[PDB]
Amino acid sequence: VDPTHFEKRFLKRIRDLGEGHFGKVELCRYDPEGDNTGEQVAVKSLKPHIADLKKEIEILRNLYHENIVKYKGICTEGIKLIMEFLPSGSLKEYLPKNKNKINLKQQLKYAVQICKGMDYLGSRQYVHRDLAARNVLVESEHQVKIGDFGLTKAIETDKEYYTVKDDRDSPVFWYAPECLMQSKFYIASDVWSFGVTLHELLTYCDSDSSPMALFLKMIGPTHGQMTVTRLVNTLKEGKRLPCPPNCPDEVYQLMRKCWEFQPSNRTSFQNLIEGFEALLK
Amino acid sequence: VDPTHFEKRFLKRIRDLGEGHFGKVELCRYDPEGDNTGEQVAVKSLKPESGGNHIADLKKEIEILRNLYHENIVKYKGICTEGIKLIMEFLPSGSLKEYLPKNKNKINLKQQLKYAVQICKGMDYLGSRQYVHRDLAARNVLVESEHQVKIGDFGLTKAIETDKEYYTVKDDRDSPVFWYAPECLMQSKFYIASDVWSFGVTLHELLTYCDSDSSPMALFLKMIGPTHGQMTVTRLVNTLKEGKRLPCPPNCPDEVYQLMRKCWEFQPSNRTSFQNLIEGFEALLK
Ligand SMILES: N#CCC1(n2cc(C(N)=O)c(NC(=O)C3CC3)n2)CCN(Cc2ccc(-c3ccccc3)cc2)CC1
Numbered sequence: 096v097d098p099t100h101f102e103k104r105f106l107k108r109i110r111d112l113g114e115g116h117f118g119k120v121e122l123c124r125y126d127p128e129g130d131n132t133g134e135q136v137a138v139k140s141l142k143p144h145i146a147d148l149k150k151e152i153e154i155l156r157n158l159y160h161e162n163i164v165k166y167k168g169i170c171t172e173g174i175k176l177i178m179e180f181l182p183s184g185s186l187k188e189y190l191p192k193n194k195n196k197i198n199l200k201q202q203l204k205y206a207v208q209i210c211k212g213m214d215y216l217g218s219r220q221y222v223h224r225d226l227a228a229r230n231v232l233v234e235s236e237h238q239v240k241i242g243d244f245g246l247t248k249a250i251e252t253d254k255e256y257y258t259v260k261d262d263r264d265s266p267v268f269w270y271a272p273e274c275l276m277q278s279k280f281y282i283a284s285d286v287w288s289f290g291v292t293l294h295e296l297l298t299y300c301d302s303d304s305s306p307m308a309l310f311l312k313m314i315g316p317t318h319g320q321m322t323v324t325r326l327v328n329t330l331k332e333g334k335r336l337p338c339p340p341n342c343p344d345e346v347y348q349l350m351r352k353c354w355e356f357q358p359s360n361r362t363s364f365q366n367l368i369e370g371f372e373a374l375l376k
Numbered sequence: 377v378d379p380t381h382f383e384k385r386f387l388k389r390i391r392d393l394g395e396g397h398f399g400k401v402e403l404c405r406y407d408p409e410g411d412n413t414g415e416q417v418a419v420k421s422l423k424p425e426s427g428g429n430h431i432a433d434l435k436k437e438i439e440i441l442r443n444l445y446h447e448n449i450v451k452y453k454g455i456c457t458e459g460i461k462l463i464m465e466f467l468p469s470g471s472l473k474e475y476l477p478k479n480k481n482k483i484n485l486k487q488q489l490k491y492a493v494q495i496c497k498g499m500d501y502l503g504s505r506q507y508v509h510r511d512l513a514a515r516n517v518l519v520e521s522e523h524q525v526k527i528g529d530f531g532l533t534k535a536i537e538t539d540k541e542y543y544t545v546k547d548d549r550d551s552p553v554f555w556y557a558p559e560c561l562m563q564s565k566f567y568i569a570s571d572v573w574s575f576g577v578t579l580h581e582l583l584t585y586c587d588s589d590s591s592p593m594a595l596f597l598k599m600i601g602p603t604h605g606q607m608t609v610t611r612l613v614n615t616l617k618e619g620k621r622l623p624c625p626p627n628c629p630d631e632v633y634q635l636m637r638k639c640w641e642f643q644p645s646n647r648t649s650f651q652n653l654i655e656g657f658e659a660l661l662k
């Protein structure tokens with residue numbers, strides 16, 4: 096018996112966790128005894144892209160880090176990705192609900208854990224390209240995990256970036272200017288996304304101070320097909336998301352190093368881990 | 377009786393000639409005698425659910441056109457007030473987009489260069505009055521006769537301040553991006569030199585008889601290509617940064633393509649002027 100082979104006939108749908116417009120992530124129970132005692136799993140599948148999900152499956156199968164969601168296996172009819180279920184969900188769901196329990200010290204420990212997870216990915220020559228609070232899962236009050244790798248791409252040995260072709264669904268309010276301007280994705284681009292994610296974590300993912308809400312207030316909400324060129328212009332003039340309420344200036348200064356215009360001038364994940372650990376002493 | 381005062385009760389709507397986001401231009405007959413012998417007129421008006429600044433902007437447009445007098449600018453006729461309406465002459469041939477595909481056999485290169493000259497004279501008259509047009513495209517160039525064109529819409533026209541070189545725009549979501557200079561796409565800044573860049577695109581349209589399969593939009597989307605209703609403009613900017621331009625129209629001589637390329641220098645200060653373009657076409661027509 097292969098423990099990473101899930102039979103379709105025992106994978107019972109409970110409900111949806113998430114949707115792109117090419118597929119979904121569902122809560123199922125793997126229940127081979129038919130009595131509802133089976134483990135709950137998160138199951139990624141396509142609407143009725145296949146090559147892309149097969150590559151994503153193969154990336155996650157071979158990642159093993161305490162701050163990366165666990166691969167559990169596949170269901171093959173078409174193919175489904177079986178992952179551990181984290182019932183606390185993303186930081187976007189968990190933080191608004193748990194402000195009273197989650198103080199600054201705990202936010203800096205989640206930041207360190209996100210940086211460790213990201214630096215392990217970068218070490219395997221991957222660029223994530225979708226690092227946001229909605230993709231960071233809460234394992235417990237004390238631990239988070241990167242929970243989705245839908246846009247993760249390999250960087251070829253002795254290249255520095257991956258160039259993207261399908262960009263129409265880009266999370267632009269999280270993207271470094273080289274991604275907006277030239278569709279180029281470097282590890283330094285994930286560091287820029289991490290700065291935005293840290294901004295979300297420090298605002299407890301409140302929807303009224305999201306990266307999108309705050310950038311739209313800055314550039315104007317009614318520019319349609321010009322939205323992205325105004326955002327790049329704004330970033331060109333030096334403007335950045337403001338210091339979160341209650342956020343100490345030396346945390347804000349580590350965030351700002353994620354957002355130097357030029358990839359080569361941004362902080363490393365290792366430098367961020369050291370900065371946060373210094374603040375935690 | 378003011379001949380520029382059109383009474384609503386005599387303005388009979390016939391059909392739509394054009395539609396934007398906030399208003400339309402309609403073919404009407406102004407028929408005071410009630411017997412269908414009145415003149416046909418083109419009528420610009422706002423949609424009911426109009427919006428914030430649209431009335432102010434149409435009233436500015438009306439004052440702009442009222443005081444333009446040039447043989448290659450559509451003629452103001454008057455207004456209708458009740459929800460103000462701009463009354464213009466009606467040109468039954470329509471725009472180059474309607475006319476050129478139907479009339480390839482009679483419109484040869486010499487006639488195309490004369491139309492280019494007449495567009496540049498109209499544009500240089502508008503520039504002379506400190507206006508930037510910001511919408512110069514074949515769909516806004518009307519055909520008076522086989523021998524004459526007129527610039528027939530001023531919906532985006534603005535005054536450049538005395539001792540400024542550009543106008544900065546804020547309402548941009550409906551921009552004709554495949555006609556826009558990089559400084560318009562990147563900074564929403566509009567110079568007379570920006571209208572020169574649009575003129576070069578409009579020349580390309582004229583030289584392709586406005587065929588839809590070689591439109592500026594079709595040719596740029598095949599270059600960049602059809603990516604997202606959110607990243608399209610930043611790919612287009614990148615394409616232009618790298619030096620890519622619309623190719624030479626089939627049958628277009630290189631000496632005409634070279635006048636068109638002087639329109640499309642990346643830096644506004646490096647682009648040809650309208651008076652230079654007129655000179656170059658006139659040299660070719662000799
Ligand atoms: N991490 C995280 C958040 C997502 N996620 C994963 C888990 C987990 N493993 O437990 C989870 N948990 C919860 O929501 C619990 C109820 C509170 N949410 C995973 C991504 N998904 C969005 C998504 C992204 C990509 C696709 C997709 C699939 C195939 C092809 C193309 C795109 C589909 C959905 C949102 C939920």
Ligand SMILES: N#CCC1(n2cc(C(N)=O)c(NC(=O)C3CC3)n2)CCN(Cc2ccc(-c3ccccc3)cc2)CC1
Nearest residue numbers: 393394395396399400401418466467469470516528529531
């Ligand atoms: N020139 C030219 C082509 C337009 N146009 C003007 C005329 C004319 N005077 O004869 C014309 N003629 C024809 O089409 C004949 C039948 C073949 N077309 C005018 C502009 N319009 C587009 C447009 C532009 C702006 C607005 C607008 C109105 C109010 C508020 C905001 C925007 C509405 C429509 C397209 C047709």
